[PDB]
Design a protein around this ligand. Sequence first.
Ligand code: HEM
Ligand code: HEM
Lengths: 145, 145
Amino acid sequence: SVYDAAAQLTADVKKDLRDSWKVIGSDKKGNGVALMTTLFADNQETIGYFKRLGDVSQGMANDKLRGHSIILMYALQNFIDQLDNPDDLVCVVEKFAVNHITRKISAAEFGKINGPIKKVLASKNFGDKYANAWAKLVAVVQAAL
Amino acid sequence: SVYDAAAQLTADVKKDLRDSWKVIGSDKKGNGVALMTTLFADNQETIGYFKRLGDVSQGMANDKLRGHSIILMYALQNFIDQLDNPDDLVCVVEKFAVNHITRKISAAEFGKINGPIKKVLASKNFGDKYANAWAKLVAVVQAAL
Ligand code: HEM
Ligand code: HEM
């Protein structure tokens, strides 16, 4: 359930999430496009879903992909800001879950973002500790799918 | 064009937007729900468009309405943060425009949000100059619809 998943975000997890978000959230365009191109390069089978964004190999030059990527980083901004209150974190998680359920994205396929996040964190010198904290936040969205 | 509408927001308009957003954007849940409930109160004809949110007269108690309202406020946060780079503001505006075009929201119907915005600004004592600055930002999205 989303409520049990949300209960796993302990004080330490929340701390690691905010501390890493301080660094990767400072460049939403850059790290957002980085997240997306790493997803597509590492998991080429997901590109079919992003048919509306056109030629994703163009990266930053693709205006629809740049728009999409910035907006995705504000969804993560939103989750970080709701960590104090689990009732609000769950209702924004469930709204974004609906946007993925209508695109037929399963929990397993949503989980493919963990690889990209681990990599962008590692290029900013945030290791496995931080990648695991973010995997727990992704798990809250997965519970809603 | 959308870029034209973007490029004409002047330094004083951007200042007024940022100053009012420092206050109305600091309580995204309270002010987002207030925005949505004032739209439904004054423009009852729009209620049918939001049937996914269920009973919107429940206000803050309605989880789907609260989640939607918080996410709307992050779309505005995104717009405010992109004010100095028209190319980034135009690609995030075009993405949100697609969300409304698919729901068949015309430029005139999107403009119905100006009444709610004026009133929420007024509750924090931001007058007509501020309401006019926000109508110019809303007009950038109308240029995409
Ligand atoms: C950190 C995880 C992720 C977050 C926070 C996230 C967030 C978002 C947001 C905010 C949107 C825009 C929704 C809309 O306007 O309709 C979106 C769209 C989308 N997402 Fe995700 N997403 C994530 C991971 C994924 C993954 C891993 C997949 C695919 C396996 C996926 C597939 C989609 C698709 C297909 C769209 C629609 C694209 C379009 O047509 O514009 N998302 N996502
Ligand atoms: C400040 C202006 C507005 C902003 C920034 C805005 C933003 C948003 C956002 C971010 C979404 C979610 C998109 C998605 O998940 O697919 C949304 C949904 C929607 N908006 Fe707006 N919106 C605004 C004004 C309006 C107005 C004035 C109308 C109606 C005349 C409207 C009608 C809709 C509808 C029908 C939905 C879909 C609701 C649902 O089924 O979830 N929006 N809007």
